[PDB]
Write a protein that holds these residues in place. Sequence first.
Motif, mmCIF file in Angstrom:
data_model
loop_
_atom_site.group_PDB
_atom_site.id
_atom_site.type_symbol
_atom_site.label_atom_id
_atom_site.label_comp_id
_atom_site.label_asym_id
_atom_site.label_seq_id
_atom_site.Cartn_x
_atom_site.Cartn_y
_atom_site.Cartn_z
ATOM 1 N N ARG A 1 -9.807 10.220 -5.132
ATOM 2 C CA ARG A 1 -8.761 10.348 -4.469
ATOM 3 C C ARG A 1 -7.646 9.184 -3.678
ATOM 4 O O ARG A 1 -6.727 10.129 -2.654
ATOM 5 C CB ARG A 1 -9.293 11.375 -3.024
ATOM 6 N N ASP A 2 -7.938 8.004 -3.611
ATOM 7 C CA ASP A 2 -7.323 7.215 -3.420
ATOM 8 C C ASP A 2 -7.337 7.707 -1.784
ATOM 9 O O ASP A 2 -6.285 7.699 -0.938
ATOM 10 C CB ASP A 2 -5.992 7.395 -3.943
ATOM 11 N N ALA A 3 -8.415 8.129 -0.836
ATOM 12 C CA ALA A 3 -8.823 7.655 -0.030
ATOM 13 C C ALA A 3 -9.723 8.001 0.610
ATOM 14 O O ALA A 3 -10.749 8.063 0.024
ATOM 15 C CB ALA A 3 -8.470 9.428 0.485
ATOM 16 N N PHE B 1 0.500 -1.011 0.137
ATOM 17 C CA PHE B 1 0.228 0.147 0.336
ATOM 18 C C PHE B 1 0.921 1.074 -0.362
ATOM 19 O O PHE B 1 1.568 1.692 1.010
ATOM 20 C CB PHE B 1 -1.171 0.210 0.977
ATOM 21 N N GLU B 2 0.689 2.285 -0.861
ATOM 22 C CA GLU B 2 1.329 3.152 -0.808
ATOM 23 C C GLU B 2 0.418 4.081 -0.391
ATOM 24 O O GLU B 2 -1.083 4.376 -0.720
ATOM 25 C CB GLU B 2 1.446 3.787 -2.125
ATOM 26 N N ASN B 3 0.448 4.864 0.425
ATOM 27 C CA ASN B 3 -0.227 6.210 1.133
ATOM 28 C C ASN B 3 -0.368 7.753 0.278
ATOM 29 O O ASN B 3 0.576 8.465 0.502
ATOM 30 C CB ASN B 3 0.070 6.658 2.617
ATOM 31 N N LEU C 1 -7.874 1.395 6.731
ATOM 32 C CA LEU C 1 -9.183 2.309 5.925
ATOM 33 C C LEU C 1 -8.862 1.758 4.968
ATOM 34 O O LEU C 1 -10.195 1.224 4.556
ATOM 35 C CB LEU C 1 -9.368 3.708 6.463
ATOM 36 N N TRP C 2 -8.485 1.530 3.951
ATOM 37 C CA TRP C 2 -8.046 0.905 2.684
ATOM 38 C C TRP C 2 -8.519 -0.675 3.379
ATOM 39 O O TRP C 2 -10.028 -0.961 2.227
ATOM 40 C CB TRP C 2 -6.652 1.237 2.381
ATOM 41 N N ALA C 3 -7.563 -1.124 3.444
ATOM 42 C CA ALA C 3 -8.185 -3.196 3.287
ATOM 43 C C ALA C 3 -9.797 -3.052 3.892
ATOM 44 O O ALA C 3 -9.956 -4.225 3.751
ATOM 45 C CB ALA C 3 -7.582 -3.777 4.432
#
Lengths: 348, 348, 348, 348, 348
Positions: A92-94, A45-47, A59-61
């Motif tokens: 936004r990848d968030a 994972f790249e934050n 949160l992504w998982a």
Amino acid sequence: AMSLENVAFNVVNKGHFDGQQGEVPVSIINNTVYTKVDGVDVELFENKTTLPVNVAFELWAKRNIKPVPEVKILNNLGVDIAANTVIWDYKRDAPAHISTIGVCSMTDIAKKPTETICAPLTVFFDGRVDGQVDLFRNARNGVLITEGSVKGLQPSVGPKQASLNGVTLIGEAVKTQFNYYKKVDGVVQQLPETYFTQSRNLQEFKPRSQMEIDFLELAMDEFIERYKLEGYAFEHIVYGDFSHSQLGGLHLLIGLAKRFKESPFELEDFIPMDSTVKNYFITDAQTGSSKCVCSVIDLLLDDFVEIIKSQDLSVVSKVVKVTIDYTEISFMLWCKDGHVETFYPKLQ
Amino acid sequence: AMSLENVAFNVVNKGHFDGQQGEVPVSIINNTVYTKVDGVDVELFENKTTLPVNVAFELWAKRNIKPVPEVKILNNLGVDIAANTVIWDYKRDAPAHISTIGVCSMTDIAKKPTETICAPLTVFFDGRVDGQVDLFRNARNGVLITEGSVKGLQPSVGPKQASLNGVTLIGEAVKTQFNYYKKVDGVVQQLPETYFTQSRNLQEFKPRSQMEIDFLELAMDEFIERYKLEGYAFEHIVYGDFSHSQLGGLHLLIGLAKRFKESPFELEDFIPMDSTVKNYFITDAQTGSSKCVCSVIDLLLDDFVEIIKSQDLSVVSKVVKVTIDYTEISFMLWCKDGHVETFYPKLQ
Amino acid sequence: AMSLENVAFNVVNKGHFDGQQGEVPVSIINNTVYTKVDGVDVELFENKTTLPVNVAFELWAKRNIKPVPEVKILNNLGVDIAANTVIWDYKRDAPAHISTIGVCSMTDIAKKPTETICAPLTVFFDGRVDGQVDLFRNARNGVLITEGSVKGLQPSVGPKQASLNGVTLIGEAVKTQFNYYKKVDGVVQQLPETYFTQSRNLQEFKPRSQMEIDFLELAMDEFIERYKLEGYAFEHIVYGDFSHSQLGGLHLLIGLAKRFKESPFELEDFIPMDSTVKNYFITDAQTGSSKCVCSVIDLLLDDFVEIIKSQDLSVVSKVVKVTIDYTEISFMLWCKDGHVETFYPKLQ
Amino acid sequence: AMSLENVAFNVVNKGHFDGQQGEVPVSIINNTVYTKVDGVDVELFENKTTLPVNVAFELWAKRNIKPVPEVKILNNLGVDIAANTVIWDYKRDAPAHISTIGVCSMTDIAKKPTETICAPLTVFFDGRVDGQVDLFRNARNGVLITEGSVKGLQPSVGPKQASLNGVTLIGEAVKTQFNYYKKVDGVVQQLPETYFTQSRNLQEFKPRSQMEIDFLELAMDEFIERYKLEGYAFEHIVYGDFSHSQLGGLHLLIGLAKRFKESPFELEDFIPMDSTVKNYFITDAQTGSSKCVCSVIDLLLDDFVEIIKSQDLSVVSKVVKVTIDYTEISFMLWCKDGHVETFYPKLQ
Amino acid sequence: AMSLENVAFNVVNKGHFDGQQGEVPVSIINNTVYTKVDGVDVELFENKTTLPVNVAFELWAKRNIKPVPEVKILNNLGVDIAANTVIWDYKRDAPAHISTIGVCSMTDIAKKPTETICAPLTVFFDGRVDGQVDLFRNARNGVLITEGSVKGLQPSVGPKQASLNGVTLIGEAVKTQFNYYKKVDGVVQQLPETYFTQSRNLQEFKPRSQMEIDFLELAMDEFIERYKLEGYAFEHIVYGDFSHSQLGGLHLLIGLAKRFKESPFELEDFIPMDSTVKNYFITDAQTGSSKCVCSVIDLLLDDFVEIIKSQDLSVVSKVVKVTIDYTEISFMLWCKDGHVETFYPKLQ
Ligand SMILES: Cc1nc(C)c(CN)[nH]1
Ligand SMILES: Cc1nc(C)c(CN)[nH]1
Ligand SMILES: Cc1nc(C)c(CN)[nH]1
Ligand SMILES: Cc1nc(C)c(CN)[nH]1
Ligand SMILES: Cc1nc(C)c(CN)[nH]1
């Protein structure tokens, strides 16, 4: 029984967080989570968020892997937080929301949406999850989606499309059309009558009506003839004018899609987020025509034609307010001698 | 059952990793580990190592909290790794060793030192831990410390001092003097006869003999008179010469300590690590005398006097090899007319 | 009219944010704010918080520069946010509170504490600011400090000391003793009877009573004789036992202060934050006695003597609850044959 | 005579490290190496590894620019390190191995593979480099590749394809098919009989047999008719079932390639590394069918047909172990009434 | 009246810096600028420059949005800085120049180019901006572009194409062909006669002459027949030789474009910047032919044919200097028996 190594075990072994037991060795460097696989580090994972790396990873998982409302719809309804899930904003990848409820110990403001901290926030509830229709009934503020009827609650039919793992689609193997309900200060609100944006891409645009099929196949002057669009400035508004240094009109996504097949152009998404109306700094590669703020909306051409044909054209300039994706969009209507000059989603 | 949140729980609740069950919410930002305490982030560990932040945090939490050999001693004996513990290097704020055995999943090369991967490495064994004297007996390469006798094994008495949580001290409530043993390829080695450095600080220096008490109390010319040191250049070597632009001698820590009471000086530790001989770029504040590489050794003055008085002084320049802290330290001896000019721990 | 360059202008020209007009060129690198001064970058602020660098910089520039309650007091009273100011936590070098009211556009949840978002939060009000006593009267939840009487409101006298720019002191040129008031759901609370911690440093400790003057001057067995402390285990609890590997007692700051004059020791502050009870991993340099979690409280010796002398000593082990700094502190009381064995601020 | 500026000179002037003399000015910021070209910084290397930036830059510049075995093959053979070269993993943008031998001073564990440190590690040897076949003969553990015969050594014919600068291909101007040899504990091991994965991309998939040409051209029911595949569940396993919320089968890359021409889909590579069996979280864009862990293998359809047709189908569920790319792949075979239900590379 | 929040307001509301009044909340984390939109951070700018994040953001927002000379042209003319504008280098995602004049307080060396600091630097002037032709007349060093005549100044017709927001194009709605003027030490210099590179992409290459149309349509041996190119080694130089391990020739972009339609290849741009001659590490995917430094130039095939046909072919090896994009390009010409063997842009 949450941990970084357990979230990583779930990511490696299940593709997402599935509540499984186990741990994998993890290493955090920069803003990236890595796992050791046969002696070497492999990126998990790249934050790209403003949250700490391990918090964003969790949160992504723990993201919702079911078809969910598009972030623009949730934003237009005033959703502040989601009940016991994470809505991941793929553009936004968030996370779509700052805080969580019953998801991550770092972002949680509560474990259950029934806690008094949630009362003033518009909580998103998912009728497909057991007990969430009841949680919506007892929540002071909230937005609910369901697949069918809720006894006594008057529904609002949402758009046909939903986002599944970042992919916007009209579901065939899954239901993507939901009933929508909203509550403000303990009171169920009447959701307005609304048009919906089509959520199409410029590169893979597909017509969704005979009018749209004709717009893309027919030449400008014959399409306008067939659909009685003379005097509505579709030449400027939809087709676009690439003759002067400043690009003229080009506010409907279908117009950009048509132009794209002939010649390419640059679209700078300077506020990269999901929104009903998008703003782009466009540079046409063929002519060199350009515009700093070209507001673009993806309405079904029939809906846009219906909107523009239902306006009084006897005034030089006025604001036309149209409800699209549950929000009021202000359009600037410019007329002359009973004919349209331009009609664009007004830049606030 | 290792995890970041569990190591953090142990740090917050036990002061170090104690194998306790539990988790605390953690956030990782930059190279720092934080924990949420009543809504706000509190720093737990700032990574000053070259390892990933979470890995360094775990190794520091799993550090040895008992008095252990100083890193310079372990290095001098060729220790590569430690058996089922982490030796924390407080001078570098990093693990003394690259890899671990039975400590952290990211750094472990093995779970037990009996694994064939460990056979070629000099493993550090601690007789105070059950079974480690036996592990040393079966290890091909290793260094063992004990508080008392090991049947059949001839001991080497180590220094009086040991490091307890980064504090070097001669223990009163704990034993700090250990017996040392070493094996190279299955053969118990005969550790050489050795002097030991005293590991004292410049700011809190304390004399450890009557000669040292006299050096600090008496003036230069009367101390040299009392101890028959005429012709041994203690004026240059120990006391230091601050009359020229280049600072003369000043290679014994006691001399720096004496000077420090009268006037301050800057010591730039350009290779900040634990070592038998230290190198400093010194600038004397009172005179402006300075030297780029002033090698400093902390020997008991009696030991240094014994070393210098046991040298043949009939040659201009030669290398004098001394076993200090188990390692061979080359000194440069400069003479003229049967008298010493200078004697310093050689810069290689 | 807030901006990064304007906050920086205020910092450079006024020492803090003073609402002045102007801008200075700023550059942001890593987590540090720099300003150009005659061609070169000069550091203005190094971010040690978990907030974005520019946001932390603004909050620190907008910190309260008046004597304010110590963060441990505000935390103990349940303060969530402050009204139109920033309480800077100098122990963490970060804002004491997550959000602000009328301070910074990035952290603000409201502009005025009268907004319904603030109603469920305990807002800190400062009677020294015009209108804040009235704001407290209309706030549902809040904590108020004043220099004198508030009509009708029964006061709670706070500690003598307050924090002025990170310096805890009993004011001579400024008032540091405040009256405290608290409201929970619109009801003015009766603040409990409480002891106060003295907030003294180990290095610059000063006795604040004749008992404390006698503790520091007299020897252990004669002080205990003078104050009739026989059987209360002050030898273990206050003086400390440095004879075994595990350091005995040493839970009162005055005892650490006394020990500090004879010999130094290491105190590892593993949860570095302001709190009524502090936890340290202590290593005594002289003896090598150590303890992973040595809870330390700074009570006036007379107050600690009063607390321990008011306990029933007929039970092996029990929890003694004491209101200190408005919060309930659990102590563990261990007895044997009607005499105290140990009494320490309980580790939970 | 290694240096950062010399590696950078080689990168700028030769495209890689070529042992040339010279230096170029370099600047390191963040994790990126830059060089000054006509007054401005130009990016030379963005570090995506867990190694320090300058170390990763040197290893990448010293990467093998000849066709080499794909990382999945080296991993399957247990390669730990390479002899006097760097195998760059282009999928991970990092070195395939932690340490080096005779390559970089920071990563080197030895200068020559004959050093006793290398004895327990499986060293990769390249017969195309002078002396490396002899080095393999004297190495205790190792993997050797050659273009032709090695006297006395029984060869294993590897796959047709090799990786040239990250491009997997079957060489025409260069040899890509190598003979493989392995040694464990001084003993040459018999490499098993093995199938090979085809290493094809989904976007540029090309059939490599008449069966594969027919699979992509013919419809499902007629292909299965032509190749007598009735009862082998190719409809589920290879073609995929997109009718339910959970995507059915779709475990052979050729099936994904066929589907890709009709409609797009998302493949989330959650463990992004080269491996014989790949795992993807797939979301079909057209139907909304999805699966968290869809194991995908790229076997030549004829090889997969041969594997599935050589299984006893009289059991409900069993593990079928097949050697592919030198490793044993466990397949889960599910049957009912003598017919296959599913056959997938078993998720461990 | 510059500020970070004002630049961000302009970016959000105008697509670039337009001198508008207003502020938006900004947060800086890592090297990225974010803005808060409906509770969440939205990325505005990811810094890829070696400048501080806020400084790069301001320079990018203040970038020239008019068609400007390509960076390779400005570099070839020795431009050091631009007058009152920023030339953004889109290939490097950084400002084309280190410093500014009247643009940003952090990068400005002057406010006006008439300041003595600018005298020794070649300032870029834009005749399309009022007063800049006069500023060029009074500048000691400079480069001027205009759309028409400048009284008394002898012009140099530049290339047809210019860069508009990163898009290289020959303008139809805007003028892209400029007159060029240069001054060194107060003296207007005669710009040499020059060819121009075509600035085409490999992926979207379009022929710009009948010769180029024939090269792409016709087979190798018939094109060479039609254009009398026998003996000029176009087979090696333009078409490329993919038969040996080292790729032969392939130095003209049109040759790479032709090859690209049949089979793909990797081009590693190891010095990623705009330049007249480009260097790539090429790996042909079909054959495995490769070359570390393949110099590539995009000349119109007619211009390249004219250059090669105007050379004396009676020498084994020589340097042929040709002025292209105002700079002298050295070509290595290799001959044998009066015929060309190779002709490539010489690697310095
Ligand atoms: C959707 C998503 N997956 C990952 C691994 C990220 C981080 N860039 N984002
Ligand atoms: C000895 C030590 N304690 C801590 C918390 C560190 C990190 N700098 N190092
Ligand atoms: C109290 C304080 N001042 C400054 C400049 C900071 C940033 N570390 N903190
Ligand atoms: C193959 C490769 N080249 C470079 C410059 C990198 C760094 N991202 N990786
Ligand atoms: C042209 C450009 N726009 C932006 C936002 C950047 C930063 N990567 N570069």
